[PDB]
A = this chain, B = another copy of it.
């Protein structure tokens, strides 16, 4: 006898907007000689807009139901890796420079 009543009359819903910005990794790069690494960008974002909507309707009087909703997300990482190495670089974006040297010497 559980009467569930929802009455909607003469409703007027408008202008329901959700906005998100750009998600760029390596953009607008006029520089040079540069190591640029974006390592594992993970995006679980959610942009939504609900207007006059409903969810699930479960009419279960006296039910022995079982419902499992599992979302197992695995992102395990094991890193032993040299990342972003820059060595022995002569970067001259200026003008009129003279006699610029970079020397590396290694014995073993």
Binding site for B on A (CB under 8 A): 1-108
Contact = CB atoms under 8 A, between A and B. Distances in A.
Nearest to A87: B87
B60 A57 contact: no
Interface of A is mostly: strand
A38 B35 contact: no
Give the oligomeric copy count: 10
B9 A10 contact: yes
Contact of A34 (B25, B34, B94, B103): B34
Given A62-B61, A67-B65, A85-B82, A26 B27 contact: yes
Contacts of A3: 1-5
Given A18-B19, A32-B33, A90 B93 contact: no
B14 A15 contact: yes
23 contacts: A1-B3, A2-B59, A6-B8, A10-B10, A19-B20, A20-B45, A20-B47, A32-B91, A36-B36, A36-B84, A37-B38, A37-B83, A38-B38, A38-B39, A70-B72, A72-B73, A74-B76, A81-B83, A82-B83, A89-B90, A91-B91, A91-B92, A102-B102
